Each structure stands twice: as C-alpha cells, then as structure tokens.
C-alpha cells in the first residue's frame, strides 16, 4: 500500500557534455624496418551523458522473479612461438658512413 | 504503507562536463627498426556526466526475488615463446663513420 | 508506516567538471633499434560527473530479495620465454667514429 | 513510523571541479637500443565531482534481503624467463672514437 | 517512531576543486642502452569532489539485511628468472676516446 511519489516542476538543465580521446593502434610512422605489433585491443568502455533521465521502473510486490544480467569475456591465451622477432637488420638514416657490415654464421 | 515522496521545484542545473584524455598504443614513431609490442590493452573505463537524474525505481515488497548483475573477464596467459627478440642489428644514425661491423658466429 | 519525504526548492547548481589525462603505451618514439613492450594495461578508471543526481530508489519492505553485482577478473600470467632480448647490436648517432666492432661466438 | 524528512531551500552550488593527470607508459624516447618495459600497468582509480547529489534511497523495514557487491581482481604472475635482458652492445653517441671493440666468447 | 529532520536553507557554496599529478611510467629518455622495467603498478587511487551531497539514506527498521562489499586484489608475483640484466655494453657519450674494449670469456 505504500505510496512513491516523485513530482518535478520547473526544472531547467542544460549543458551536458562528455568527451573521450581518439584510440588509435599504430599511427604516424614514418621510421622503416620496425616491429610494431598491437595484439588483442579490447575495449569495453562507456561515454555517456544523462539529463534529467530516469532508469528502470519496476513495481512487483511479491514477485520471485529470477533476473540475471552477465557478461562473460574469455579469450585466454597461450603463445608457444616468437611474436616479434628482429634479426639481421642494418638501419643507416645518416650518409657518408662506408662499410658497413652486419654477419650471421649459424652452423648447425 | 511508508511513503517515499520526492518533491523537486525550480531546479536550474548547468555546465555539467567530463574529460578523458586520447589512448594511443602506438603513435608518432620516426625511429626505425625497433621492436614495439602492445600487448593486450584492456579497457573498462566509464566517463558519465549525470545532470538531474535517477536510478531504478524499485516497489517490490515482500518480493524475494532474485537479481544477479555480474562481469566476468578470463584473459589468462601463458608464454612459451619470446615476445620481442631483436639481435644483428646495426643502427648509424650519424654520418661519416667507417667500419662498422656486426658479427654472430654460433656454432651449434 | 514510516515516511521518507525529501523536498527541494529552488536550487541553482552549476560548473560541475571532471578531468582526466591521456593514457598513451607508445608516443613519440624518435629512436630505434630499441625494444619497447607494454604488457597488459588493464584500465578500469571512471570519470563522473554528478550535478543534483539522486541513486536508485528501493521500496521494498520485508523483500528478502537476494541482489548480487560482482566483478570478477582473471587474467593470471605464467611466462616461460624471454619478453624482451636485444643483443648485438650497434647503435653510433655520432659521426666520424672508425672501427666499430661487436662480435659474439658461440660454440655450444 | 519514524519519519526521515530532508529540506534543501534556496541552494546556490557552484565551481566543482576535479583533475587529473596523464598516466603515459613509454612516451618520447629519443634514445635507441634500450630495453623499456611496462609489465601489467592496472588502474581503479576514480575521479568524480558530486554537486548536490543523493545516493541510494532504501526504505526497506525488516526485509532481511541479502546485497553483496564485490570486486575481485586475480592476476597472479609466476615468471620462468628473463623479462629484459640486453647484451653486447655497443652506444657510441659520440663522434671521432676509433677501435671501439665488444667480444663474448662463450665455449659451451 | 523516532524522526530524522535535516533542513537546509539559503546555502551557497562555491570553488569546490581537486587536483592530482601525473603517474607517468616512462618518459623522457634520451639515454640508449638502458633497461628501464616498470613491473605491475597498481593503482586504487580517488580524486573527488562533494559540494552539498549527501550519501545513501537508509530506512530499514528491524531490517535483519546483511550487506557484503568487498574488494579483493590477489597478484602475488614468484619470480624464477631474471628481470633485467644488462651485460657486455660499450657506452661512450664522449669524442676522440681509443682503443675501448669490451671482453667476455665464459669456457664453460
């Protein structure tokens, strides 16, 4: 029998405002020979701007009601090779350098 | 028979604002032949602006009812294998310079 | 029978800011030949902003509901390989250097 | 029957603000042949600016409901492989260095 | 039957303000050939900011509820191997040095 009452006059809002930056992977990159390697980016992120709202309305006396609201995520992992390997690499930005010699004699 | 009674009158609310900063993994890389490695960057952040606003509105009297609300994040990892691996690597960014040399005899 | 009465006249609320910087893994890197590994950056922040905002409201009088709101993470990490090996490397951003040698023999 | 009877009249509520600074991992590394690591960077934080803002309302007289809210965060590391590990490397930022020499020989 | 009476008349409350510094992991490293390891920074941190707010309210007499809110963080570490170890390095800012050796006999 109880009563919730919930009366609003005159309201006056305004101005709401939420920003985020920009997410970016690999940008700008103007070097050669690298690596760069992004892996498994998740994102669960919210940007949200709420004026003068109101959530779920629920009225059920009595009621035994079973509600479940979940979220599951698994992305487990198991490496068992190299994600970034660099080997043998000569990387001369300047000029005018003579001889210059990288080797690699594996004898297996 | 209680009684929950909200009474709101001539509410003027304003300048409600929120900010996040950018989130870049990779960005603005000139350099060459370096080995950059993001790994699994999660994000569960939330920017919220609320201006006048409400939650649920629960009547449940002698419910009983039950109500799971659960996240479940299972990511685990298990490495067998070098991540960032870089050898025989020769990097002159001046000029001029004479015999440079790089050597890797094994002999297995 | 017990009455919750709460009542609001007149109220004149404003300049309500929230700020955050960025959260960059990798930016402005002019080098090279260097290894850079970010490993797992699991973020959960929130940046909110309230400005006369009431909660949830409950009405629930000999309710015996249950209510469960968990979050749960599992993101253990068992490495058996090296994350980041640099070797043999030459890095001379002078100029004019002469015989510059590295060498590595291994007779395994 | 007890009664929880709040007033607010004539509030005049201004200038909430709060900040934060940036969380960067690796930024602006002019430096070449270096290690950087950044091994499971995890944030809780919060920032939040409440103006005039109420939490949750309960009018609950004897109903034994059960709440729990919890967090749990599990992510336990047991490592068997070196995380950074650099050898025979040669820096010369300098220019005009003559018979700059590294050698390991490893007999195995 | 006991009664709970707040009133609030004619409030002004102004330069609510909150500030916190940067946690930056790495930056600003013009050095090469370093190993710089930033090994699991956890942060919990708060930065708020109440002007005239009030917290939950909470009418539950004889209520019998019980009311879990936990946080739980479990990150125990059991290192095996080497974090960071640096061996065999030539590092030579200055001009015009000769004749710098490096050497590393293991005959195991």
């Not at 892996?39 to 919210?46: A, G, N």
Request: charge should be positive; glycine fraction near 14%.
């Amino acid at each position: 029998g109880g009563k919730v009452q919930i009366i609003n006059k005159k309201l006056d809002l305004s101005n709401v405002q939420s920003k985020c930056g920009s997410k970016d992977n690999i940008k700008h990159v103007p070097g050669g020979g690298s690596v760069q390697i992004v892996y498994k980016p998740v994102d669960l992120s919210k940007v949200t701007s709420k004026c003068g709202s109101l959530g779920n309305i629920h009225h059920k006396p009595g009621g035994g009601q079973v509600e479940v609201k979940s979220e599951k995520l698994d992305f487990k992992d198991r490496v068992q090779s190299k994600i970034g390997s660099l080997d043998n690499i000569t990387h001369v930005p300047g000029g005018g350098n003579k001889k210059i010699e990288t080797h690699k004699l594996t004898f297996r």
